[PDB]
Amino acid sequence: MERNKLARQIIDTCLEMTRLGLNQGTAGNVSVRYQDGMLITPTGIPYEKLTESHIVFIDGNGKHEEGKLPSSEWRFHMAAYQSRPDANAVVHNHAVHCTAVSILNRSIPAIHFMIAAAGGNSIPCAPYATFGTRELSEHVALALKNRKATLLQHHGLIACEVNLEKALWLAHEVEVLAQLYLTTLAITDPVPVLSDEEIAVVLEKFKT
Amino acid sequence: MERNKLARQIIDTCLEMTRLGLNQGTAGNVSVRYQDGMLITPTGIPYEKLTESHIVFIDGNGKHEEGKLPSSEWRFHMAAYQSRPDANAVVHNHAVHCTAVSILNRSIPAIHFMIAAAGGNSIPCAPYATFGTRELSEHVALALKNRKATLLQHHGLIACEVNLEKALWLAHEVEVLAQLYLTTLAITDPVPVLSDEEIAVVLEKFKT
Amino acid sequence: MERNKLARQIIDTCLEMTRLGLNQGTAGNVSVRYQDGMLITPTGIPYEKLTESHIVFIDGNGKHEEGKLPSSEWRFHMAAYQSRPDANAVVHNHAVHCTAVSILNRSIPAIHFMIAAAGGNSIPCAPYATFGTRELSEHVALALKNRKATLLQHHGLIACEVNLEKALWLAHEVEVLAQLYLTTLAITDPVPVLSDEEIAVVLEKFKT
Amino acid sequence: MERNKLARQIIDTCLEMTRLGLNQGTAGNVSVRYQDGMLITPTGIPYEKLTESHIVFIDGNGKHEEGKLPSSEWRFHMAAYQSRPDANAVVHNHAVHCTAVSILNRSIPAIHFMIAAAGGNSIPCAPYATFGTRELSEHVALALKNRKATLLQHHGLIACEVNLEKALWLAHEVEVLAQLYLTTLAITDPVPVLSDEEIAVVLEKFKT
Ligand SMILES: [Zn+2]
Ligand SMILES: [Zn+2]
Ligand SMILES: [Zn+2]
Ligand SMILES: [Zn+2]
């Protein structure tokens, strides 16, 4: 649990994200909870050119390391960590299916039982606010109070979990749910959903 | 036909499944008929971290090996083996196209002559029941009486065949048929189909 | 221009076809004009297990080499060669977009100027007939009289050209045109097309 | 900044373009501003067979090097360079989503804030003209006056930027925006957009 081991994992997650089809270009940003703040990917630098020393430390006051420029979206990573004390890693990307659902400004309802992985019977869609602002941060903190992932209107996705592996896994699962929703929505509106009682059983089984 | 050779094949099938775009995350489970029960993938463990000793033996009574946790969906693998004595391998996944069709709760009709590979003029869609329950198992056993593959409402796909290679091959073919169906359904409803007499000729030719 | 060099190219084309996303499972078959007949891929054998000695010679009378089983669809390869004397290689597959258009039983109209690569202002769709029959062969020979590629209703695609490289290239281009057509058809019907005068200029430029 | 270093980058961009899913077959062409004209990819030659000595120099008068045949679309590369003095690299391809939007003859509106990367609140669609003509060149020069990328009706995409890395990056981003637009258009028409005031803030933030 040293800085260099955590910085490698961040970089590996960025790579895996691109391999999975979730990250296009310079879109995503990944962070881990560290000491009193977090370690996050830098702004600008292409994923494949990323080295361990590129990773940026931002303390709990929002002061970033000297000589580095953190992701332009670091503020909502810090919002996630303060709103969900159990979150230790945050993955943000502009995955195509999730982003298309966020353009329609729709929550993803319970079309599949794996929706319970984010904590409830839906994936919310937080209202639009300019990237990097305090207004965006507040919408994100409110959307993550009872969910581990949220869409961002006209923007993309944020997923948080107990470690990077799980955070990536959830982000990928939400992109599948988004794709399922858009494919079925093009055929029938509304899309058949599982009832709240059924999601309630699946949530209890997921605890077990 | 030793346990270790069969466990490698299971693992290779999981890998190939992910390579083919049919398996996302920790979704699929694969099994082979063995001795008086089966060998199946474990619950939890990521596909890429899978080693031969991770594969779990479940006897015909449903007792699993000591110290291992079988897939959470082992019960419908056992249902498949008891309902179709000719089945020696079972592939389950949550492939996107198949799962989207299962959300609409539709059978795939004879839109292409390759539908005959699953035994008839359609791919059925068995009704929803919570994962891992006896209720789900009974729907699966009934859907596989005269078909080698079935969709599972709000869930995914099960395909069975005489060996893993063929089971994977069928699962992939059903994902293509699902994609064909959804792409054409978005344009015209209903989708043109081949008549039962024509599927009857194709089935006789497939025996030859 | 020896048999072994031509058999390698067939195998390389099968591999490239799978790499390009045009061939799923055991669906495609590839042939080259040779001596008085052709060399074609065998029936059954997975693409990755294909060796040079697996390639089958079928003479101009339809007699195939001893101990080998040619593709089950060899008859329409022979139909192509007899209908288009300038064709030296034939690529057949069940590519998803082309096959979805063939299910709707539609020709692809001139939605893009690259449609001229197949010889005219459209890609035809020949009527359904059981695979491997003389009836299918006759529809294919008639569709290829003034076109180098045709869809096959409820089935897939055939493309022919002067060598394998060009035949593969055309097959890939027709899969792109099919995808363009289905994506736009889901939005507006009918799809805007280029006029015959414009396709006439593009065809003259393609000669130059 | 020698010719051979610039020719490698062109070739690397062609390869990366194919890897990204933006270039199918022999469709794209890439150029860089050089001396008094440009270096561009040749006509005909497959991307994978491309060597440094294949790259063609075209002076500012349109005279091309002896013994080489420049891309058939070099004229609109020269149009781009003369219309946008700040452009140093041009990427053209027939990416599927962009091309499908160009078939509908629609501009992409501000459905996502990344639309500001091309300079404004939209990606224009320049009217159809035969490839390689002066008429096409004039439409392209007019579309790029206040935008760094444009669709070409019934054809594809052109993107220009300060170097090849950025030009490729923009071309990829526009293909994502096209995909977002088509996916949402199939569900609802018109698609929700961000207001001009909001795009105005995002453009100021992108300067900062
Ligand atoms: Zn973002
Ligand atoms: Zn399952
Ligand atoms: Zn066929
Ligand atoms: Zn072009």
TrEMBL record, chains A, B, C, D:
EC number from the UniProt entry: 4.1.2.17
Biological role stated in the UniProt entry: Involved in the degradation of L-fucose and D-arabinose. Catalyzes the reversible cleavage of L-fuculose 1-phosphate (Fuc1P) to yield dihydroxyacetone phosphate (DHAP) and L-lactaldehyde.
Pfam families, sorted: Aldolase_II
Keyword Lyase: yes
Gene3D superfamilies, sorted: Class II aldolase/adducin N-terminal domain
Signal peptide interval: none
Active-site annotation: 73
Domain Class II aldolase/adducin N-terminal positions: 8-182
Protein name, UniProt field: L-fuculose phosphate aldolase
Co-factor note (free text): Binds 1 zinc ion per subunit.
Gene Ontology CC annotations of this record: cytosol
Binding locations of substrate: 28-29, 43-44, 71-72
A Gene Ontology biological process term: arabinose catabolic process
Summary of subunit composition and partner proteins: Homotetramer.
Keywords on record: Arabinose catabolism, Carbohydrate metabolism, Fucose metabolism, Lyase, Metal-binding, Zinc
An annotated Gene Ontology molecular function: zinc ion binding
